[PDB]
């Protein structure tokens, strides 16, 4: 999957901004959230998040769930580098293992678990 955000900003601008955000908010991680290519699910109004590193992935699911106005019966899946991240992880842990070289963590969401 390609992210619109990577398609709109040259790599060097991304890395420069990511580097600065990590220095300026060391208790947080910068995260880009976009809908997966062929997913049938609501749109997400905002895609750039400055997330406390101690927030769990589970809590972030809930937060994103709310922004999309998903009902509880509705499914939501995160994908990071083709892996579904564990809900028990903190966003800081997820960020450490999966952030890209522009210092951003990219998360795709979908109604499908594949």
């Amino acid at each position: 999957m390609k992210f619109v955000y990577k398609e709109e900003h040259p790599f060097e601008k991304r890395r420069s901004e990511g580097e600065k955000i990590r220095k300026k908010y060391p208790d947080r991680v910068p995260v880009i959230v976009e809908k997966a290519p062929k997913a049938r699910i609501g749109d997400l109004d905002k895609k750039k998040y400055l997330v406390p590193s101690d927030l769990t992935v589970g809590q972030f699911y809930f937060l994103i769930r709310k922004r999309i106005h998903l009902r509880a019966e509705d499914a939501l899946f995160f994908f990071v580098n083709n892996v579904i991240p564990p809900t028990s992880a903190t966003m800081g842990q997820l960020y450490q293992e999966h952030h890209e070289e522009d210092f951003f963590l990219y998360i795709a969401y979908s109604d499908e678990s594949v």
Binding site: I21, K48, Y49, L50, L55, Q59, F60
Partner: peptide, 14 residues
């Protein structure tokens, strides 16, 4: 909520 350079600042719940 609060945004800095269009980044949405997420609060840590209790």
């Amino acid at each position: 909520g609060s945004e800095v350079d269009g980044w949405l600042i997420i609060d840590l719940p209790d």
